[model samples]
Target: AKNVGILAMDIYFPPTCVQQEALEAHDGASKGKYTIGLGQDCLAFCTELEDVISMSFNAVTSLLEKYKIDPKQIGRLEVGSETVIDKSKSIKTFLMQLFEKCGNTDVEGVDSTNACYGGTAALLNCVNWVESNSWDGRYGLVICTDSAVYAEGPARPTGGAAAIAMLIGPDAPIVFESKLRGSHMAHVYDFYKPNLASEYPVVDGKLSQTCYLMALDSCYKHLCNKFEKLEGKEFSINDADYFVFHSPYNKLVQKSFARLLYNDFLRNASSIDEAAKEKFTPYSSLSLDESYQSRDLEKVSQQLAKTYYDAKVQPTTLVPKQVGNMYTASLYAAFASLVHNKHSDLAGKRVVMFSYGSGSTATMFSLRLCENQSPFSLSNIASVMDVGGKLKARHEYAPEKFVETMKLMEHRYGAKEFVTSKEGILDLLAPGTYYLKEVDSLYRRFYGKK
Candidate 1:
């Protein structure tokens, strides 16, 4: 079998952020609501000068520069985003300018949309294409970009923005365990953007949580079932070294992983220790619907999974907890955070990733890692991302300024024919970064790279 998976990767987020603690205080809410309740540290958000296209450009261009991959070598490009910059134009077309310079206009694939699940969809397309005989022996580039914002109140703190570009090819260190993949998709309005005029989502918080946990149960069960048949051994939480989740907030990530543990205990999987299994074994007979609503099991499972969670899930939470949700980029950003922090010792480890989006879709997949190699490996990917440095360098705006920018973003959400001040709020953009220059009268957006 040919080796095929992510060969290299890079990520980008705005330099601007708002400390959740400060915002909590600023909002006159309970002291630890955002920091403790939501488990968020800070939020990365765009200014008037930045949007999905600019972040996508910065991420893609930076990946090309760092990996020294010829633009002409890219055979396909797929952009995954829920940020609706233009209803008609896909972000992939905006990115075509770079390939056009090299006359590589033969690129295949376009934007994949389904809320947060789009990134995984785009990645699967690239991997499938590479594994297919039709492949041109080039590379597939996948970009997941989004700016997740909400109207003022409880949902506001969950918002964040980012772009990630992953290069896909053969013999990758981060190879997908394709057969073990499992997915669940259905019709449910747990969360959605219905009114095109507003950037906020129509979220049914209680219903959304129920839907997310329910979908997770379905996917995890299916994933384990498939893994057992393929490997001739039952799979469990302990089978994978880490679990990365699409984080609307860190609290949800915590809940989701614990939910997995409860599933394992219910199945009497040997991965559960005697003491822990005994603790949860009493509730094994609960119906699926009843189990989901059991607060006792919920609390007990999370408590039991805390140590295991810290060992496996904590490393992956760095970015999402600090930067907030990047929608389609959320799960991969968590994966990226793990790579950034643990690349030094990640060889031979198995990782399981869960991606969830609403309206609604969910998937659980696995990856196996090997020692770093040339041009396209984990070591170089971590170096290129400089995730820690980027986190340290962010400029934390006062809650007032953050809200003011949101007001501006609200007005400019879909309006065209506007020019922005690159010299003012955009002054903080780093060298080689891209930003919005203007939108013409025809609503054609023009972008510039510093």
Candidate 2:
């Protein structure tokens, strides 16, 4: 069987950001509502001149350039996003500009949208296609791009923007453990954007948290069952070398991995200490519905898991905590953070990832690490992203200035035929970075390579 998975990856976020610490101080909340409460440090968002398309463009083009891959080598391109630019046209169409110059218009996939799970859907399509007879001996590209923003409120600080492009193919350094994949899907109104008139979402903060943890529990149970059947042994949180999660906020990510630790105790798995087992024993008999609604279980599980969490999940939290939630891009950003910080030690290790999107969809998938797949090495990927450098280089905006920019964006959301001054933040983007130059009266969008 031909090996199939991600070969290379690149990530891009706007250079401008607002410090959450400063935001908390400015918002005049108690002390830590935006920072400690949300478990976020800073937020990166598009200015009036940027959107999903431009971020995606910069990420893809930069990946191809840095890897020196010919544009024609890409046979399939898929975009995963919930950012609505056109009611009918797909974001994939706008991305075709990069391939058009090389006469490669035959890319085989389009946009996948189902809240935050779209990226996972798009990624699976590319991976499955390569494993199928449609394998054309070229590469499949998956782009997870989003601009997560909200009207001023509690959800506002949870917002962030970014685009991540992954190059997929066989003999990859990061190989998919496809057989171990598990998924859970259902309907829920925890989060949604029913009103297309504006970019803000109707968010139920409390319900959304409950929904995320519940979906995570279901996905983890399914994954463990498959692992046991395949390997003739039980699996637990310790089975995977690292855990990556879809983070709307750092607080939730912490709660999520904790829930998994609670799972091991329930399963009577050996990896969890005896003390943990006793602590959670009282709630083991709770029905799924009862457990989902139990505040006591939620609090105790998070507390019990804290000891092991720092050792296992902290390395993956760097990017998501710093960049806030990138929605579709959030989970992968956590994976990238692992590659950035722990790649040298990751060979032959297994990584288990959980993806969640509201409306809703969830999955638990695994990846195995290999060393030096030529251009797609651990070192190479980290260097291309330069995650550490980018975080340090960002221009932090004050709460007032950040609000000022959002006001400008709100007015320009769907309006057409206007040109931005491009005099402020546009001047800060690096050369070769893509930005929106104008939207013509006919509603045609023009882009410039800065």
Candidate 3:
């Protein structure tokens, strides 16, 4: 198989949202803390009516229906999620209900979990299956689903819920440059879920931020070496048309792109101009650890890379900024935003993608976009996603209502045998959206479609 990449795609984020500005005020934070400091516009979260399973079902079903693909055509279905509902049962098994309905019980794959990087792992596994001799000539589907709900605090503003489904096969418009991949993995306690009783993670905010950037630096360095070996030329930020990162928040994304700019300067890449060189030259003597901590270098690089960031990275920030962080789905949601914003201009362009999951695994990969025919082209994928329409259709909840919902979820998390209220939730769901109907005493979950 050649060009085994995303052939079709769809995304599902709950219609319930809260503005970051409102949240900041409600939390008694200074103005612009969330809106400007976090660089987020809004935050989306799931009510009791939805969870990762329902969102994944909605995304996968929507993608198949929109692309006119039969369920039986999928030979492998992979799910990546950090949201744990059942300790022993896999989310992949829950999704099997979709395939089983069509009498297609042959789908191969299970869930990949490691924080936000599971999606990348699932995607790579499916792509590898397609390129391997054991491959059956059927389609491979990948679903990235997460409901990131942080405990009440500063991390609360970063909570988001979303699911993204991508159909993978040969001759795809979104072709993977498989050989040009770099990965960095390490053990770190930056962020983790230790209790398992609560859904919230125990986080070390400052440490996680530094870990993210360090992993990014290592991955970028490795990728550059691979590119140089294959092409016999040095690689720089200039080589890719766009760069997408696993956005925990928008500010981090800004800093990440700037980090790439600093990497270019360190390598003495020809992409840097003389004026920028002079600005970065003073920081040349800083050690790696010192560079990560330097406020001066960060501010200067971000200021200098502003223009390039806008052109190459801004288009990818729309969904992530509006929806907040989707955990496993966050990076792909950013990619979906790129397709939505630049569908027409992306053909023949090279896009660099970075995926990070705390506790911690990270990979830097490349995708080569092609102008394929309709139904499988970038434009069609963008049209099917309807990101702008979804964003506009959302119903913004007050901060108080959001807090109430979170409180209610705390009780509903591990409990069973309760029906959700339809007064404000069920009626608000979009058509074909799947919702949690009930969870039995036996811990079996039932869902309904609206």
Candidate 4:
């Protein structure tokens, strides 16, 4: 069978950095509490110039170079982000210009939005297209970029920016398995932002936490029920090796994990009848076989219980600490961090991923990493990160530079016919403005103008 895998992946974070210590010192909070409690080292902040488009382009360029993927072979491009560069033009159109400048031409592109799940939605859509065509193995590229902005004050410290790109095609680097199942709940409140609004709508923090945890519980139960229905037995949560979540803050996710694993579900299941106990009785001296319903319910339950306990005692890596919250790119950013940090146990492993978007909706899906995939290696990612070059200090990220770059963009490409790739810069063109003029015939047909 043909497999659609991630051929390459890349990430771009803003240059302006705020260390946890600096933030704690400024706010009079304990640095240990902020760093160790919240699980964050630094946050990436953007100036006016480095918006969604620029960061996205940087990410895609890195992916292209690392994979040796020919731009011409890219048949489709999808950009997913909440912070779109322009209101009138499709971000995909802006991305097309970037790709064209990089010597890629004649590719169709579009944008997708679904709160924080936008990137995964784009990936699913690309997978569908690839499955439908099944031609000479074309590639579909998906880029997710976001610069999260919180209203001034404490929330502002949590905001950051990043972008990730995934290349998809059959026989590629990382193939996605279809065991991916999920459940979603949508509502009008909890969180939302209108198109005219510059920032996300806020909800009561306590209420938001309640909603998130409840949603996760529902999804987890639904997944378990579905598995039981399919396989004729309840699958242990530990059946999956890793769990990645859309983390607004690392604390939020850890809290949810605590609620799900230690307090709610585990506590409720602790009083099962002796017959329902099975193998776990050996460990705890409970009468498990007193009412056994035949089969291996005892052994199954015991195994399941042990698995869950072990997972909680020794947890998997959390990616939110390094990248911060990426809005729509949060989950994928976490996945990218795992790849970059060389979380080896994740290779050829099944991971349960939770994606949540405010207003509020949540989904749970499982993904298995493919074995022997070249892009799955850390060496490949390290090379890409090394080449992308980091913009070190906050001083280097001046708003004036952003404004100047915008002006330069206009001067170099303003209302003029210019070659896409000048020298070897490709998409790295100096920031400038370029205008598109409608021809008389096209204008007459579309706009009733002569």
Candidate 5:
């Protein structure tokens, strides 16, 4: 049996805040449509100072501290992002420079992209690589970061940014289970963006929706058939406690859920038994003896009702409704939310996660929360976001700051220098083995001696 554990985890969100009300004013949509209907409150706005590189660095630093993993021992670092800072410079190079700021100087790194699935692909690749090199006790680290941007309108209300880091090895904190299973459908242009573009990708909303649900159905059915044949028993969706979806919007995902379960609801309703009726009676508030108003009910009436209520009312949507979509990081953010919210009901439970990327790819994976791992806690996640800064207002998110920060990158020497300011901006820097300093408005420093 092969085992891979998640030794450490960390995440980072941009400092700038975009209030949902501001978005409503921009889009002219009812506030409830977004906040109540969609369950979103605020979206993170990344400043010029935090791009794919900086954000990835922030998350990796947190993971290192949380796991107390030695950077010198890490063999590989993989980064996944749709957004690139420099066309010529490989993201792996930029990430390495960022890690050097945190005293991680001895490691090879690579960057990958497949839209939103890029992170998962990287993780899978790392797992295979580790398995091939099992004799070395090699460790692999992957960072997934994205800033979801929409054109200036109602859709922009859902834009958010986040980054996540996962350390993988044989004795990881969380073991990766379930042989990877899923179907990939290509040549389906549900979403796409070309080179050097910054705005939202063009999406065929209706077509994309169809593709998403159909892909999920096909993969799920395949899994069901395969599992049933292998285990000599029937397989059902009810086996998994929760399903985490790639939430582009709350409404869209709800529709996907409806598509997946509508058939089950219909089939289960046709043959409910007395026990099933009893199980569902509490939800209807109907007495067993008082059955005059609706004799038209069939055998599985209560069973169907129970199924509907379970799907519609009981489970939670792990979508980061408060923050907007995070592109590649969106699904991970939902996973983080499950851990952050501390839903005791999901304790020692199995969670099914659907990873969908707009290029028309979907993957289904299952994870069981370990009793030793505290899914309810997020000290590691919080510590990463708390590092090195104060939250900035929209106005403070100046384009000039981004230009100034970029200038700090010394391509030739692989070092950055910064000047101090009276405003104490530099003092806010998180005191870690890794540190960044501002030398002037246009220059900064990156150095670590650990």
Candidate 6:
């Protein structure tokens, strides 16, 4: 198999959302705190009617049906999520409902959990499978699903829910530069869920931001080294046409791109002219630890990189800013945004992706694109995702309703022997969406399609 990568993609986000400006006011936050500070527009969240499993089911079903892919054609299906509904039971088992109906029980792969990086891991596994000899020449499916909900605090605005499904096979329009990959892993407690009882994570917001940027720095260097080895030249920001970061929030994304420019400056890459070099030289004396904490360096580099950021990274910010962070789906959702916004011009372009998961693992990888034929083409994938329509169709709940939903979810997080009220929310779900019908006394879940 050559050019092994994603052949098609579909994303499912709950139609129920909350505007950040409204949320900030409701939470007594200063004006533009979440809207400007976090750089988010809106947040899509699950009501009692939905969870990660249901979202994943909807996303997978949509991808298979819209792309006209047969269930039996999938030899491997991988799930990536940190939303733990079951510790012993994998989410992949729940997804078997779709495959089993078609008499396809031969699928391989299970679930991967690593905060937000699981999706990237699952994607890498599928791509590697297709590129390996053990491959059965069947399509590999990857699902990244998460419903990120923080407690009633500053992080609340970052909560989001969505599932992204990508079909992996040979000769893809979005082909991975498999050899040019770099990863950084370390032990940290930046963000974690020590209590399985609650769906909320214990997050050190400041520490997590620093950890993310640090991992990005390490991964970018590793990727540049790999690119240099293979291409026999130095790699710079100019090398890739687009840069997609794991968007926990849009502000982090802006900072991450600026950090990349700083990296290029430090490396003295040709992409940085004398003026840029002179501007960055002031920070040359700062130590690695000091550099990560330098606000002056941050502001200056962001200002300098603003033009490049608008050109290379802005196209990918649509979904993340609109939908908030999708955890494991965040990076790919950002990529989907790029495809939705610029699929026509993406042919023959290079796209660089950075995946980050707090606890914390991060990677920088490369992709080469070309407009393929028909359903597998970038334009078709963009049309199928329909980001603009999805954004416009969403029903924005006021902060009060969003808060009420969150409180109810806190109570229902791990409870059993209960049925959802369904109420007016069922109608809020679009057709073909899966909803939580009930959970039996035996702790079995039942879902209904709308």
Q: Deviation in angstroms for 336 in model 2?
A: 0.6
TM-score of 1: 0.98
lDDT tens readout by residue for model 4, 345-425: 545667677777766667777666655545544356545654224433233323333334334433432123332222322
**Candidate 5, which segments miss by more than 4 Å at Cα?**
98-109, 195-200, 263-319, 343-347, 373-450
Instruction: Write one digit per residue (lDDT tens) for candidate 5, span 1-450.
Output: 255645557777655555565555555577677776666666665533444555677777767766677676677788777765455666677667645765767675577777787777777677666777443565788888887554344465666777888877664334555553555667787888763434446788767756766677666666555556756655555665666767766655554454444323323533344565454454364442232123333233433444643543224344355556777777776666665444344446666667778777777776665534432123443343332232332222232332233233222122234332314232333334232323333333343321
Give the backbone clash total of model 1: 0
All models: lDDT? 0.89, 0.87, 0.92, 0.59, 0.57, 0.92
Q: Which digits, one per residue and each the tens of the lDDT, describe model 3 over residues 232-327?
A: 999998899999999879999999999999999999997789999999999999999889889999999998799999999999999999999999
TM-score of model 3 relative to the true fold?
0.98
Please give each candidate's TM-score.
0.98, 0.97, 0.98, 0.72, 0.72, 0.98
Ranking of candidates on lDDT, top first: 3, 6, 1, 2, 4, 5
Candidate 6 local lDDT, 61-132, one digit each (tens): 999999999999999999999888877999999999999999999999999989999999999999999988
Q: Of the pair 2 and 3, which is ahead by TM-score? A: 3
Could you give candidate 1's per-residue lDDT for residues 119-232 as a string of tens digits? 989999999999898899999999999995664766788899999999999899899998897888889988888987776668887787778888899999899999999999
- Quote model 5's TM-score: 0.72
Query: What is the descending TM-score order?
Result: 3, 6, 1, 2, 5, 4
lDDT score, residue 137, model 1?
Answer: 92
* Candidate with the larger lDDT of 1 and 2: 1
Which has the higher lDDT value, candidate number 4 or candidate number 5? 4
Model 3 spans > 4 angstroms off = none
